[PDB]
Amino acid sequence: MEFSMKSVKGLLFIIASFILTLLTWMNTSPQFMIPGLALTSLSLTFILATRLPLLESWFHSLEKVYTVHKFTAFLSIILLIFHNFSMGGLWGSRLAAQFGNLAIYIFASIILVAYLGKYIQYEAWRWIHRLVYLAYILGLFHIYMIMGNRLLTFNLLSFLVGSYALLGLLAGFYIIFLYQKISFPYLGKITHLKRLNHDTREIQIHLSRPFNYQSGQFAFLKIFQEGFESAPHPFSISGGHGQTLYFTVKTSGDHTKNIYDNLQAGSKVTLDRAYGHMIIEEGRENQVWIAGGIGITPFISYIREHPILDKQVHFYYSFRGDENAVYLDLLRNYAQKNPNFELHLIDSTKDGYLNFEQKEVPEHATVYMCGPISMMKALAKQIKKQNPKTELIYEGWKF
Ligand SMILES: Cc1cc2c(cc1C)N(C[C@H](O)[C@H](O)[C@H](O)COP(=O)(O)OP(=O)(O)OC[C@H]1O[C@@H](n3cnc4c(N)ncnc43)[C@H](O)[C@@H]1O)c1[nH]c(=O)[nH]c(=O)c1N2
Ligand code: HEM
Ligand code: HEM
Secondary structure (H helix, E strand, C coil): CCCCHHHHHHHHHHHHHHHHHHHHHHHCCCCCCCHHHHHHHHHHHHHHHCCCHHHHHHHCCHHHHHHHHHHHHHHHHHHHHHHHHHHCCCCCCCCCHHHHHHHHHHHHHHHHHHHHHHHCCHHHHHHHHHHHHHHHHHHHHHHHHHCHHHHCCCCHHHHHHHHHHHHHHHHHHHHHHCHHHHHCEEEEEEEEEEEECCCEEEEEEEEEEEECCCCCCEEEEEEECCCCCCCCEEEEEEEEEEEEEEEEEECCCHHHHHHHHCCCCCCEEEECCCECCCCCCCCCCCEEEEEEHHHCHHHHHHHHCCCCCCCCEEEEEECCCCCCCCCHHHHHHHHHHCCCEEEEEECCCCCCCCCCCCCCCCCCCEEEEEECHHHHHHHHHHHHHHCCCCEEEEEECCC
């Protein structure tokens, strides 16, 4: 039985931090039963927030990373409840107690926005969420103002505190004001803007520095221009080698609509880094491909780079009808030139969408899936129902 090995290194970071907190506290000084955990949980929280590649690897992918972000947050806040229970009276002297109180007021408010806020419009959510930071500062003041002596000691308590808080802080500071400016500097200019259905625009980009990524990965993209929000948004390559780069976009909501029908052909543009683990090249000798139409870009990227297949690949792409269908011709070029390639294309309009019950596909083959998350999750489960002896990876674009 072999559940989630690589993720586990990520997990250990959690476990370790916690147990290390706990033993430390009980053996030496368990003066406050709960808070130690709460705080280290927070430390972790920031650390995860970082979009740090090193721990990206450990926790595997963004999807996983952000998942754990939520996990820690949950734990933390419930524990703040119990700490607030340990207070007894909400206002207090207000000499210090109110600091703690005030922090949780804002924290609670915002974390409680998480559900409702993510419902509609995440731009606001960007800024609001960041207010969490301010509240964290207040939290630190609460404790430092109270337990000065012990923190400045040699006690493992004291170092543990120092380190875990500090990491958290450094991360915090960094993610609030730094990731955008140090990470986006990979530089870029746009090249060509090209129009496909209404769903879609594709863009070509040239770079002050020649770029690198593993085939199938993704990056976030930031722009300097006229009344165009620069904020980084997730994207999966449509082409890349050397100085040269291409991204493909479906019209989504407002920002994406903006680039669909507005983007001025000249702009100064910025790129954080490669991320994600849809590593085509690393996949098995046989690879099987599933694309929700709008979301076929990774596949495209690997087709455009390397004109000959690593090994034979079975590919399926679902697009409803020509009316939505994009890239048809470019795929078709590939097919003609590429004997090694097996290609299936679906107008879900007629007959409908694809189910794999009445399908057999070689177990000895990694399966790669990118689509609207609904379909992707469904698909996955039905393919599992086909065969656990098969190798399967599936992604849906969320956060
Ligand atoms: C790993 C990965 C890879 C890609 C993508 C996502 C992820 C997670 N996307 C999706 C891409 O983020 C999305 O299509 C646009 O950024 C939509 O931005 P709007 O401001 O229009 O979002 P708006 O809120 O108006 O609606 C679009 C949807 O995208 C979500 N979204 C997009 N960016 C977000 C962000 N930074 N924070 C939170 N939610 C965000 C919104 O939450 C919403 O559900 C993508 N798209 C694409 O066209 N081509 C691509 O190659 C990729 N690749
Ligand atoms: C259930 C609890 C939580 C939810 C639902 C939540 C939700 C989110 C969401 C949706 C984002 C946007 C994702 C991104 O693009 O970065 C985000 C970002 C972030 N969160 Fe959280 N979060 C939670 C807890 C926490 C905690 C506990 C911390 C810190 C201790 C934290 C710190 C951050 C930071 C620093 C960012 C990055 C902001 C930026 O620079 O863009 N979050 N959170
Ligand atoms: C409404 C929120 C909170 C209230 C009312 C509160 C109240 C208090 C009170 C009354 C004390 C003793 C000092 C005093 O009474 O002046 C205290 C100590 C402490 N609180 Fe809080 N608190 C809150 C939130 C938090 C949070 C969110 C954390 C950690 C994340 C935390 C961690 C601690 C720690 C660590 C101590 C002392 C332990 C030590 O320094 O070794 N508290 N709190």
